[PDB]
Amino acid sequence: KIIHLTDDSFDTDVLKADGAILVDFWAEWCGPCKMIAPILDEIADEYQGKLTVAKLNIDQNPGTAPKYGIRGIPTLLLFKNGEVAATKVGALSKGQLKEFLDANL
Amino acid sequence: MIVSDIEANALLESVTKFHCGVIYDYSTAEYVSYRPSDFGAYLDALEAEVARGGLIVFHNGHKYDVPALTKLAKLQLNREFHLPRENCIDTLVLSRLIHSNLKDTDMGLLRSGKLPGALEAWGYRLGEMKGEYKDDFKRMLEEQGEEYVDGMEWWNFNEEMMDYNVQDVVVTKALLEKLLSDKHYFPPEIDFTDVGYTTFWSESLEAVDIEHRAAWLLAKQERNGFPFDTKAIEELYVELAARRSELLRKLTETFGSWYQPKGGTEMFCHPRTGKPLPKYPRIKTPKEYVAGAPYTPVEHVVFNPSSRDHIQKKLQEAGWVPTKYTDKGAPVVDDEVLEGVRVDDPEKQAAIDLIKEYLMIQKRIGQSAEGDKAWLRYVAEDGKIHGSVNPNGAVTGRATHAFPNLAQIPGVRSPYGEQCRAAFGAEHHLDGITGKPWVQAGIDASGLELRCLAHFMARFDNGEYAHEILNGDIHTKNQIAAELPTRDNAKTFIYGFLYGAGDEKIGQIVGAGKERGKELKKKFLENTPAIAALRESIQQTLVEKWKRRWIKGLDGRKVHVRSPHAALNTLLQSAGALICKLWIIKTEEMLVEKGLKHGWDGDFAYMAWVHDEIQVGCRTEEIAQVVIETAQEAMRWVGDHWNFRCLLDTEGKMGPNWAICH
DNA sequence: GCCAGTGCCAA
DNA sequence: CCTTGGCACTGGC
Ligand SMILES: Nc1nc2c(ncn2[C@H]2CC[C@@H](COP(=O)(O)OP(=O)(O)OP(=O)(O)O)O2)c(=O)[nH]1
Ligand SMILES: [Mg+2]
Ligand SMILES: [Mg+2]
Ligand SMILES: [Mg+2]
């Protein structure tokens, strides 16, 4: 139930979505990214209705990340109507993401 | 004989004050110090030695002390001081001849650690005295609380500077006696510290005379400088930079940016298991972050065509499969491989040519304007580049050139070579009286090393090659025979071959394979089979292990052989180097005895010496015609001097600049 | 700034 | 086994 983004689809799918979108900027070569991946797969089911989980691989899609000043991965950016509502870097746990989402939702 | 040294406020280019000097006299066996107000007395002492037909010893005096004293005597005392060349000795020149196999810091200009091999002790200390003095000066001031500025240790005289001056002469005296104790250069029967100048040159090995004369002439050449066109090169820089900006724009358009791990300190460990994963990027577990939540710190990196890693990355991501690699763990990414790289995407395939162009663009930009030794950074107020020359920098007896290297200017037939070469010219110097541009005379020795080969193999073929070699131009005759595109390619081919290049190497030179390599090698070696006999005799003479490590040079010196396979190159490159060295000395001497004066306030001026070629500035075209004729006479003289078995010749060219005179 | 690796520029 | 040399540029400590 994840929306796999591209550079070209990002503007519409994220910045014009009108709702809550959690974008995960990741890379296949990152250790922490592989850790938080399965956690995201579950948050998408639980938060299906009040939030949408999206993923953008910085290798296949190199144009989006620089615009948000990415200095570390995985970068979890919570978008709310084309605006960055909250940013969190690192492989959080199921509980830490749950908190973060509920608090910012 | 006296040993001396001076301390002044700056390098020769801008020196305006004599601080102190020291003189050690062998006849009294005492040291005498001279402070700033004793300048006149110091100068008198040096002339007194000259008046006795004696000798004055300095360590780097030819390039610094001697000219410095002439400049300072006129500025401070309004006196004409001119020590004759024949009364001067330079321990640095002597050390570079005797210890030709070793490197040196070029009087502290070069990083001591970047130099290979060992360094002679006394000379090492002499080359470090200035930096060592700066260290003593800096700490003495920080003890008193005072602050150190730029290079204030040389602004004024002090007793600490005086002490280092006395130490210089004691060390120079020690180095001198260590050099004179070499029985190969100085006969044991003679006490060279107790003879007049005339006896010093006549009794010592011929090489000792040639080296001092070469160093004295080349010091003058440095002071002359090479008239440079700053405006033309600044305009060339704008053109190159504009092309670089465009190449970079298109290249970054085709090859996008990416992220890479950077800054990670912590080891990433398997969550499930626990074993450290050394292949994964280093992480960072914080104290926008959450304590305990790991993350890979990353950097954004833009494509850089000047990197060989980025090109390799991008081209392999496009399908390129590297054939040749480097002994470390990196594919070879040079112009050879780039020219042969084949991908699928037409845009990326086209980008490879932009990369090849960019690399050359950068090569020209770095040498002309941006590099640390760039021409634009080296032009003095007189509108000239005073490149340095180590008269005996190469083991073979060749000279080395640096700051900047005027012996590596791009050739007129290479991209932007005509513009680069045209910027160096006598035309760029306007006469001090008439304001009219000078004329240039470039002379180059014809087929130098091949004629040296003809000489040495004459005992084997009875001068057959020496006769055949002058049947038209050798390089044009070889070019056609070998079916080569250019005469320059024939030169690189013939020397590559002569000096033991493998089949594949000979193939690379000519633009073919190992097959063509073997053909060309045996084709030329069968024509002149005396090459094999010459190589073998060299081996029987040098190798048994080592029977003898050095080769006896044309002037008697020891020429250190580094490797058995480069022994023919040592023999031939040394012969050409010594021939050319005696050639430039004789040329100037003949011009001088013809009434011509050396200097910008005279008739001619040496601007550059690039192995077997000289570029001389001439006040008039008439003078340039004579310099060219005199150089031909001096070469024929050199050949007869050493009884060469092959006639030596030169080719002269008159013109406004280097693009036209070479 | 030092340094290792790579490459090009000239003779 | 091309040789002799200077020097630019990336990327690691
Ligand atoms: N090992 C080696 N030596 C070379 C090479 N090119 C030049 N040399 C040496 C031998 C000749 C000497 C001077 O170079 P030149 O280009 O003047 O050669 P040359 O043979 O005298 O030719 P010319 O008649 O054109 O002046 O430097 C080369 O590629 N390899
Ligand atoms: Mg000195
Ligand atoms: Mg020549
Ligand atoms: Mg030449």
| DSSP string over A51-74 | BEEEEEETTT--SSGGGGT--EES
Determine which one of A33, A36, A40, A76 is catalytic: A33
Distance CA B258, CA A70 (A): 11
Helices (H), B181-308: 197-203, 206-224, 230-254
Residue ranges of A 26-85 with Cβ closer than 8 A to chain B = 27, 29-33, 35, 58-59, 62-63, 65-66, 70-74
Distance CA B657, CA B427 (A): 6
CATH of residue A50: 3.40.30.10
Mark residue B289 as left, alpha or beta (left: phi above 0; alpha: psi -120 to 50; beta: remaining). Answer: beta
> How many Cβ atoms are within 10 Å of B608's Cβ, its own excluded?
24
- Chain A, nearest residue to B276 by Cα: A31
- Residue A12 CA: distances (Å) to CA of A21, B85, B515: 12, 84, 62
Half-sphere exposure of B504 (CA within 13 A, CB side): 0
Q: Are the C-beta atoms of B454 and B645 separated by less than 8 Å?
A: yes
DSSP annotation of B564: G
Burial of B346-366, coded b for 16+ CB within 10 Å and e otherwise, reads: eebeebbebbbebbebbbbbe
- Residue B425 CA: distances (Å) to CA of B440, B611, B617: 7, 18, 8
B98 CA to centre of ligand 1 in angstroms:
26
Distance CA B633, CA B583 (A): 9
Closest to B551 (Cα-Cα) out of B661, B452, B631: B452
| Cβ-defined contact of B297 to A91 (cutoff 8 Å) | no
Distance CA B611, CA B629 (A): 19
**Residues with Cβ < 8 Å from B481, sequence gap 6 or more?**
none
Pick the CATH number of B1-226 from 3.10.620.30, 3.40.50.1100, 3.30.420.10, 3.40.630.30: 3.30.420.10
**3-class DSSP assignment, residue A16:** coil
Pairing of strands B558-560, B550-552: antiparallel
Q: Which residues on A lie below 8 Å from B261 (Cβ)?
A: 29-30
Q: How far is the CA of B238 from the C1' of C9 (A)?
A: 22
Q: Which residues on B lie below 8 Å from A88 (Cβ)?
A: 288-290
CATH 3.30.70.370 placement within chain B: 384-446+548-662
Distance CA B221, CA B224 (A): 5
> How many Cβ atoms are within 10 Å of B554's Cβ, its own excluded?
25
Burial of B39-75, coded b for 16+ CB within 10 Å and e otherwise, reads: beebbebbeebbeeebbbbbbbbbbbbbbbbbbbbee
Closest to B87 (Cα-Cα) out of B217, B212, B179, B207: B212
Proximal ligand: closest to the CA of B568? 1
Q: Are the C-beta atoms of A53 and A43 separated by less than 8 Å?
A: yes
B227-383 under CATH 3.60.9.10, yes or no: no
Atom of ligand 1 nearest to the CA of B487: 25
CA B309 from centre of chain = 30
B447-547 under CATH 2.40.50.100, yes or no: no
The one-letter amino acid at B584: I
Query: In this structure, what token pair is assigned to residue B490?
Result: 């024939």
Binding residues of B: 5, 7, 168, 444-445, 475, 487, 491, 495, 612
Active site residue A88: no
CATH 1.20.1060.10 placement within chain B: 227-383
B662 CA to centre of ligand 4 in angstroms:
8
Main-chain dihedrals φ then ψ at residue B553, nearest 5 degrees: -75, 165
Domain containing A52 equals: 1-105
In the sheet that holds B650-655, the strands lie side by side as B604-609, B613-618, B439-445, B650-655
Residues of chain B contacting A, Cβ within 8 Å: 256-259, 261, 268, 271, 277, 280-281, 283-284, 286, 288-290, 292-300
Proximal ligand: closest to the CA of B165? 2
Q: Are the C-beta atoms of B102 and B400 separated by less than 8 Å?
A: no
Tell whether the torsion through CA atoms of A92, A93, A99 and A101 is positive or negative: positive
In the sheet that holds B258-261, the strands lie side by side as A72-73, B296-301, B258-261
Closest to B282 (Cα-Cα) out of B258, B305, B306, B299: B299
Q: Which of B284, B295, B310, B317 to mutate to test the interface with A (most CBs of A within 10 A)?
A: B295
Helices (H), B287-384: 309-316, 335-340, 346-365, 375-378
> How many Cβ atoms are within 10 Å of B601's Cβ, its own excluded?
11
The one-letter amino acid at B423: A
Partners of residue A21 on adjacent β-strands: A52, A79
Rounded to the nearest 10°, the torsion over CA B632, B635, B641, B646 is -110
- Chain B, nearest residue to A89 by Cα: B289
Q: Are the C-beta atoms of B22 and B34 separated by less than 8 Å?
A: yes
Cis peptide leading into residue B404 (ω within 30°):
yes
Output the CATH code of domain B384-446+548-662. 3.30.70.370
Tell whether the torsion through CA atoms of B26, B28, B31 and B34 is positive or negative: negative
Q: B611 in ligand 1 pocket by Cβ < 6 Å?
A: yes
Supply angle C-alpha B165, B171, B175, rounded to 5.
Answer: 140
How many independent structural domains does chain A possess? 1
Distance CA B474, CA B651 (A): 14
Distance CA B617, CA B606 (A): 6
Query: In this structure, what token pair is assigned to residue B26?
Result: 């062998």
Query: In this structure, what token pair is assigned to residue B494?
Result: 């013939």
Continuous segment of H or E residues that includes residue B576: helix B567-592
Distance CA B191, CA B88 (A): 17
Find the largest Cα–Cα distance for chain B: 93
Rounded to the nearest 10°, the torsion over CA B88, B614, B68, B375 is -150
Main-chain dihedrals φ then ψ at residue A53, nearest 5 degrees: -100, 125
Report DSSP letters for B217-240, one per residue: HHHHHHHH-EEB-HHHHHHHHHHH
Partners of residue B266 on adjacent β-strands: B283
Name residue, tokens 């000259």. B50
